[PDB]
CSV table of C-alpha atoms in Angstrom, one decimal:
chain,number,residue,atom,x,y,z
X,1,UNK,CA,-24.3,30.8,-57.7
X,2,UNK,CA,-22.8,30.9,-54.2
X,3,UNK,CA,-23.6,27.2,-54.0
X,4,UNK,CA,-20.9,26.2,-56.5
X,5,UNK,CA,-18.3,28.4,-54.8
X,6,UNK,CA,-19.3,27.1,-51.3
X,7,UNK,CA,-19.2,23.5,-52.5
X,8,UNK,CA,-15.8,24.0,-54.2
X,9,UNK,CA,-14.4,25.8,-51.2
X,10,UNK,CA,-15.6,23.0,-48.9
X,11,UNK,CA,-13.8,20.5,-51.1
X,12,UNK,CA,-10.6,22.4,-51.4
X,13,UNK,CA,-10.3,24.0,-47.9
X,14,UNK,CA,-10.8,20.5,-46.4
X,15,UNK,CA,-7.6,19.3,-48.2
X,16,UNK,CA,-5.6,22.4,-47.2
X,17,UNK,CA,-6.7,22.2,-43.5
X,18,UNK,CA,-5.8,18.5,-43.3
X,19,UNK,CA,-2.4,19.1,-44.7
X,20,UNK,CA,-1.4,22.5,-43.3
X,21,UNK,CA,-2.7,22.6,-39.8
X,22,UNK,CA,-0.6,20.6,-37.5
X,23,UNK,CA,-1.4,21.2,-33.8
X,24,UNK,CA,-1.4,18.1,-31.6
X,25,UNK,CA,-3.7,19.7,-29.1
X,26,UNK,CA,-6.5,19.9,-31.6
X,27,UNK,CA,-5.7,17.2,-34.1
X,28,UNK,CA,-7.3,17.0,-37.5
X,29,UNK,CA,-9.3,20.0,-38.4
X,30,UNK,CA,-12.5,18.9,-40.2
X,31,UNK,CA,-14.7,21.1,-42.3
X,32,UNK,CA,-18.4,20.6,-41.6
X,33,UNK,CA,-19.9,23.1,-44.0
X,34,UNK,CA,-19.2,26.3,-45.9
X,35,UNK,CA,-21.6,29.2,-46.6
X,36,UNK,CA,-20.8,31.9,-49.1
X,37,UNK,CA,-22.6,35.2,-49.4
X,38,UNK,CA,-24.8,36.0,-52.6
X,39,UNK,CA,-22.1,38.4,-53.8
X,40,UNK,CA,-19.5,35.7,-53.5
X,41,UNK,CA,-17.5,38.1,-51.3
X,42,UNK,CA,-17.5,36.3,-48.0
X,43,UNK,CA,-17.3,32.8,-46.8
X,44,UNK,CA,-18.0,31.2,-43.4
X,45,UNK,CA,-16.0,28.0,-42.7
X,46,UNK,CA,-17.6,25.8,-40.1
X,47,UNK,CA,-15.1,23.5,-38.5
X,48,UNK,CA,-14.6,20.9,-35.8
X,49,UNK,CA,-11.4,19.7,-34.2
X,50,UNK,CA,-10.6,16.0,-33.3
X,51,UNK,CA,-9.7,17.0,-29.7
X,52,UNK,CA,-12.5,19.2,-28.3
X,53,UNK,CA,-12.3,18.8,-24.6
X,54,UNK,CA,-9.9,21.6,-23.7
X,55,UNK,CA,-11.6,25.0,-24.2
X,56,UNK,CA,-8.3,26.9,-24.2
X,57,UNK,CA,-6.9,24.6,-26.9
X,58,UNK,CA,-9.9,25.1,-29.0
X,59,UNK,CA,-9.5,28.9,-28.7
X,60,UNK,CA,-5.8,28.7,-29.6
X,61,UNK,CA,-6.6,26.6,-32.6
X,62,UNK,CA,-9.3,29.1,-33.8
X,63,UNK,CA,-6.7,31.9,-33.3
X,64,UNK,CA,-4.1,29.9,-35.3
X,65,UNK,CA,-6.7,29.5,-38.1
X,66,UNK,CA,-7.4,33.3,-38.2
X,67,UNK,CA,-3.7,34.1,-38.1
X,68,UNK,CA,-3.3,31.6,-41.1
X,69,UNK,CA,-6.2,33.0,-43.1
X,70,UNK,CA,-4.3,35.1,-45.6
X,71,UNK,CA,-2.1,32.0,-46.5
X,72,UNK,CA,-5.1,29.7,-46.6
X,73,UNK,CA,-6.9,32.2,-49.0
X,74,UNK,CA,-3.8,32.2,-51.2
X,75,UNK,CA,-3.9,28.3,-51.4
X,76,UNK,CA,-7.6,28.4,-52.2
X,77,UNK,CA,-6.9,30.9,-54.9
X,78,UNK,CA,-4.3,28.6,-56.4
X,79,UNK,CA,-6.5,25.5,-56.1
X,80,UNK,CA,-9.7,27.1,-57.4
X,81,UNK,CA,-8.2,29.5,-59.9
X,82,UNK,CA,-10.8,32.2,-58.8
X,83,UNK,CA,-10.2,35.8,-59.8
X,84,UNK,CA,-11.7,37.0,-56.6
X,85,UNK,CA,-11.1,34.8,-53.5
X,86,UNK,CA,-13.8,35.4,-50.8
X,87,UNK,CA,-12.7,36.7,-47.4
X,88,UNK,CA,-12.9,33.8,-44.9
X,89,UNK,CA,-14.0,33.4,-41.3
X,90,UNK,CA,-13.8,30.3,-39.2
X,91,UNK,CA,-16.6,29.2,-36.9
X,92,UNK,CA,-16.5,26.3,-34.6
X,93,UNK,CA,-19.5,24.1,-35.3
X,94,UNK,CA,-21.1,22.9,-32.0
X,95,UNK,CA,-23.8,20.9,-33.8
X,96,UNK,CA,-24.8,17.5,-32.3
X,97,UNK,CA,-22.6,14.6,-33.3
X,98,UNK,CA,-23.0,11.0,-32.6
X,99,UNK,CA,-20.3,9.1,-34.6
X,100,UNK,CA,-20.9,6.0,-32.6
């Protein structure tokens, strides 16, 4: 049943990340996927940043995301109305992207 939670979190965390994260060095934070453990206890949030050329900026953005994790879990909780909100971890997705 982790699929429903993962799908819901992807939907909702996308919205939160677009609205709450404002850092010009990384730009829009996009959610590429979400995986949730079978026990619905943990979630992995794969993300990419609009500006990905400065390695130090990417790191600072990933630290900002971890520092902001408790607040982000609180927003998910409100958005999803879950009794137990999974712990969350952010992972930068280095998968191949074309775009154009």
